[PDB]
Symmetry: C3
Subunit: 201 residues, 3 copies
């Protein structure tokens, strides 16, 4: 039992090692998510989203798994409002199954206390054209005070209620349009433009 006590001790020491690896693994995973956010985003209130592996992303979207895609959080100015973009890729609500839906979700920001609410900044949503013709599909809207989506975010991880266009583009047009390309080499690009500040405009 001299060795047995020292053997039981080794086993409990071993298990502790196994706990640290899971803890370290999660911390590595969170680090990698934070790194991508820093690399991808822009703090000018403009964000370009490179969507890749479209067909698998689209087929997987037909399945329950990955119900919608999400961007990396971006900022409308360095210490301005923080928000993210969600693309359904096989529709949501009114556009579900026949349209690609594109909306932007406001998220809890570090500097929300400084900023005024509700959010009044115009937002422009577009899908870029890889052909270089410049015939993108772009749509824009002015926030309505009435909507609870523009209220200061409190939902932390979830973010505020998604707002945007359910019927952004017909899937047939998206897949194959006459005017442009939209999906080239199984990759699509999504652009979001927000006016970062007004002053006297």
């Amino acid at each position: 039992e001299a060795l047995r006590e020292h053997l039981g001790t080794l086993e409990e020491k071993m298990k502790r090692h196994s706990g640290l690896l899971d803890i370290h693994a999660t911390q590595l995973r969170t680090h990698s998510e934070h790194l991508q956010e820093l690399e991808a985003t822009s703090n000018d209130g403009k964000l370009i989203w490179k969507i890749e592996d479209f067909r698998n992303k689209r087929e997987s979207e037909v399945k329950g798994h990955p119900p919608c895609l999400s961007s990396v959080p971006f900022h409308t100015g360095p210490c301005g409002y923080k928000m993210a973009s969600k693309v359904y890729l096989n529709g949501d609500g009114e556009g579900r199954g026949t349209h690609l839906s594109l909306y932007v979700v406001l998220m809890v920001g570090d500097f929300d206390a400084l900023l005024p609410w509700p959010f009044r900044q115009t937002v422009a949503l577009s899908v870029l054209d890889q052909s270089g013709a410049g015939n993108h599909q772009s749509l824009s809207f002015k926030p309505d005070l009435t909507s609870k989506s523009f209220q200061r975010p409190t939902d932390e991880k979830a973010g505020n209620v998604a707002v945007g266009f359910s019927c952004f583009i017909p899937l047939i047009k998206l897949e194959e349009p006459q005017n442009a390309t939209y999906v080239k080499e199984d990759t699509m690009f999504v652009k979001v433009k927000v006016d970062m500040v007004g002053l006297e405009q």
Copy 2:
């Protein structure tokens, strides 16, 4: 002793694993510190500091532990001077115990050899008002050549001698002023403005 040699070997192998986890842990911790620095800072020579958990930070400050708070290093232009801000939260020197002290510390920069010395750039220190009135407490100074604080930093981890205002604001005013808020939802904001370059001004 055939097994014993192989058992002693396992134990020494086990200990090696335990060494790597401590080494990996430190490297994760340093990574997390570097990530925050990238996320929080601005390279325009302007920095906003979000101070959170004020009351605990203040009560802990009364105790020996956490004698002063520090910011993330920020840059006055992308390859300009590098510096950090230190807030005492219960005073230092002349303001100790009745005033909040706010100073900025110059730190060893990557591009110090390119830059001229001593530092001649004006610095503006302010505490923001959460109310939106705009009645912040803001003070600014022009560096004196005489001071050793504006000499090229050699102190590496410590940084150069802190310079600023000991009596930035009375604690009574800070806690509850008529003019503004200053601490809202147990969070305070500190702003530092530096002119990034002169040319012909």
Copy 3:
């Protein structure tokens, strides 16, 4: 064999732990490389390279090990062309052994599909002067359509064929010139300037 089965199980469990540490180590190493890239670079199409431990870097360059030095990838605008700089430090091709060679390598970029090819942006390569006189050695060129170096990069990790000046500066001049310093406190600086966009220039 009751214990033996449970002892064999521990050993196989131990080996699994050892696999995760190597996997975690590589992921930490890749994280550190990504962190430096974020910290060092600029997305304005201008990059400053701080080369340090010059003499060891130079002596090691004489040896087979470290045949050339490389920068951190930088971008010519936020979603523009992505490229890196390579300095030979004891020459390559026409300048080998008597000149320091300085070239820039185009790399596969995230937004290559958006951008037009071939690359037509002017590039300026310079070595800074630590003295503050301003007498740097700076040279610039306009890309030739003919060259395969300005073709869209497909070489992934390697990047596109290096293009630049083999005979950027004589080593004797580099080591000790009358006009300037170039290497101060065993550190050298390399600057790359690219015009980020034209429009109507």
